[PDB]
């Protein structure tokens, strides 16, 4: 996977998912202490570079069966192959 | 068998920002049921937490308090995500700037 950034005209910031939302989701471990205020922007682009290369791979499942429809067993084949995706089989069994 | 849970919002993106994001790889007219929505805003709460575990298990045995964006990136490599690592460290860089 070939991630890229595209400079642009109408982007307030350089990303668009809400670090205060992914600061709980860190917290919900009861193991975490302190998360420095640099480490949800990191989460806060890598979310979204993981959305879509999960998102394509799925697609990618998606057009080989001859359809316009992302559907969930889509997705299921895309962490079935995607090594870096195998923590997901359970979320995602089929 | 099975039970019932709860669904939390605020342990979730908002779907609408993950949507957004899922559109701009597919072509125009593609279309998402409304389970893979679910699935994808599910699955990035999984990542969040796959990654932060494999950093806070370090800074235990290392005895830090605070996971830092260092341990962010240290994390991912040991977790195999190689084509992340240099667009978010530079990306990391310029916000330090
Ligand atoms: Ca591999």
Same mark, same amino acid.
């Given at each position: 996977?070939?991630?890229?950034?595209?400079?642009?005209?109408?982007?307030?910031?350089?990303?668009?998912?809400?670090?205060? +939302?992914?600061?709980?989701?860190?917290?919900?471990?009861?193991?975490? +202490?302190?998360?420095?205020?640099?480490?949800?922007?990191?989460?806060?682009?890598?979310?979204?570079?993981?959305?879509?290369?999960?998102?394509?791979?799925?697609?990618?499942?998606?057009?080989?069966?001859? +359809?316009?429809?992302?559907?969930?067993?889509?997705?299921?084949?895309?962490?079935?192959?995607?090594?870096?995706?195998?923590?997901?089989?359970?979320?995602?069994? +089929? | 068998?099975?039970?019932?849970?709860?669904?939390?919002?605020?342990?979730?993106?908002?779907?609408?920002?993950?949507?957004?994001?899922?559109?701009?790889?597919?072509?125009?007219?593609?279309? !998402?049921?409304?389970?893979?929505? *679910?699935? !994808?805003?599910?699955?990035?709460?999984? %990542? !969040?937490?796959?990654?932060?575990?494999?950093?806070? *298990?370090?800074?235990?045995?290392?005895?830090?308090?605070?996971?830092?964006?260092?341990?962010?990136?240290?994390?991912?490599?040991?977790?195999?995500?190689?084509? %992340?690592?240099?667009?978010?460290?530079? %990306?990391?860089?310029? %916000?330090?700037?």
């Amino acid at each position: 996977t070939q991630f890229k950034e595209i400079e642009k005209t109408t982007d307030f910031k350089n990303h668009s998912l809400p670090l205060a +939302r992914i600061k709980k989701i860190m917290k919900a471990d009861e193991d975490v +202490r302190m998360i420095s205020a640099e480490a949800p922007v990191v989460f806060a682009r890598a979310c979204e570079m993981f959305i879509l290369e999960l998102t394509l791979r799925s697609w990618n499942h998606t057009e080989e069966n001859k +359809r316009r429809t992302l559907q969930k067993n889509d997705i299921a084949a895309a962490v079935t192959r995607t090594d870096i995706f195998d923590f997901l089989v359970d979320i995602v069994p +089929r | 068998g099975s039970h019932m849970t709860v669904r939390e919002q605020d342990r979730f993106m908002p779907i609408a920002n993950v949507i957004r994001i899922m559109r701009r790889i597919l072509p125009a007219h593609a279309k !998402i049921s409304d389970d893979s929505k *679910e699935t !994808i805003q599910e699955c990035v709460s999984e %990542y !969040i937490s796959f990654i932060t575990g494999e950093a806070n *298990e370090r800074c235990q045995r290392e005895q830090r308090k605070t996971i830092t964006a260092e341990d962010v990136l240290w994390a991912m490599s040991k977790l195999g995500f190689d084509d %992340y690592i240099e667009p978010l460290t530079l %990306y990391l860089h310029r %916000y330090r700037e």
